[PDB]
Amino acid sequence: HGFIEKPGSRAALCSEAFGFLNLNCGSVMYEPQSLEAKKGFPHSGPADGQIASAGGLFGGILDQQSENRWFKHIMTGGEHTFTWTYTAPHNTSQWHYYITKKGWDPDKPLKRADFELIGAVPHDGSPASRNLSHHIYIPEDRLGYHVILAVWDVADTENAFYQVIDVDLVNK
């Protein structure tokens, strides 16, 4: 299982030294970046593989009320840099990520209007593709939570990692 290194270490907020009477970590902290997905059955994890039927997309509303729901992290506006690293020696073919926008028009197809692509990084060559770290701007004028949909494709198998991560993006 790989993990997100930056922005900021979630482990510092996991320790009971951050409040004791108040802490927010749980066992889900071990693999929120590397939720394992599998072709076919059994599904075993949450409702996914159902993007076309939107069973998984509309299920994301219920996932925000799930026992397995991850601990959302607040970030303020301005530019921020995300860095991920993997503990797996297995090859990676491609990885890409999206964010959700609440407030879709009812006239527009919700299946599309719910999320937007903010980055796709195939694995090819040169030091350009070697860049695991990427810059994302966070709005300085708006507040609200977003779900990051992310996929990490492992070339050494037909199986891949599909994960969803709540972030709360606020003004300065």
Side-chain angles (χ1 to χ4, degrees), residues 103-146:
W104 52 82
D105 295 297
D107 182 63
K108 292 180 176 62
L110 222 174
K111 303 201 293 187
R112 287 190 68 179
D114 181 67
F115 65 95
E116 291 279 27
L117 179 72
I118 57 151
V121 187
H123 175 289
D124 188 303
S126 88
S129 185
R130 200 225 300 272
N131 288 306
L132 246 290
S133 186
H134 294 90
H135 294 265
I136 301 295
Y137 181 79
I138 305 303
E140 201 182 300
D141 70 315
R142 291 168 204 210
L143 296 87
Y145 52 85
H146 303 268

Side-chain angles (χ1 to χ4, degrees), residues 23-167:
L23 75 167
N24 187 359
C25 196
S27 189
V28 74
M29 69 93 195
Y30 191 74
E31 61 180 71
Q33 187 278 313
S34 292
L35 234 63
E36 297 186 8
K38 189 185 284 79
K39 297 278 182 167
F41 275 81
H43 278 270
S44 209
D48 192 19
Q50 298 184 62
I51 302 170
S53 53
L57 296 176
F58 302 147
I61 303 300
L62 280 69
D63 195 43
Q64 291 166 64
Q65 307 302 322
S66 182
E67 189 176 15
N68 294 314
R69 176 187 63 200
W70 115 297
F71 32 82
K72 78 176 191 292
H73 179 64
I74 306 170
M75 290 171 53
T76 49
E79 98 77 43
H80 296 266
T81 307
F82 288 81
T83 304
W84 291 18
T85 188
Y86 305 133
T87 65
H90 286 129
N91 293 294
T92 297
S93 43
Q94 184 163 258
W95 64 296
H96 51 101
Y97 39 86
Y98 312 83
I99 62 173
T100 57
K101 52 184 186 182
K102 194 176 185 181
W104 52 82
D105 295 297
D107 182 63
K108 292 180 176 62
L110 222 174
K111 303 201 293 187
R112 287 190 68 179
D114 181 67
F115 65 95
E116 291 279 27
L117 179 72
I118 57 151
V121 187
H123 175 289
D124 188 303
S126 88
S129 185
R130 200 225 300 272
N131 288 306
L132 246 290
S133 186
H134 294 90
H135 294 265
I136 301 295
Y137 181 79
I138 305 303
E140 201 182 300
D141 70 315
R142 291 168 204 210
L143 296 87
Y145 52 85
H146 303 268
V147 185
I148 301 174
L149 283 64
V151 181
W152 162 32
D153 194 15
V154 176
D156 292 351
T157 178
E158 250 277 290
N159 294 310
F161 294 86
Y162 277 65
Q163 65 271 183
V164 289
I165 302 183
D166 298 300
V167 292

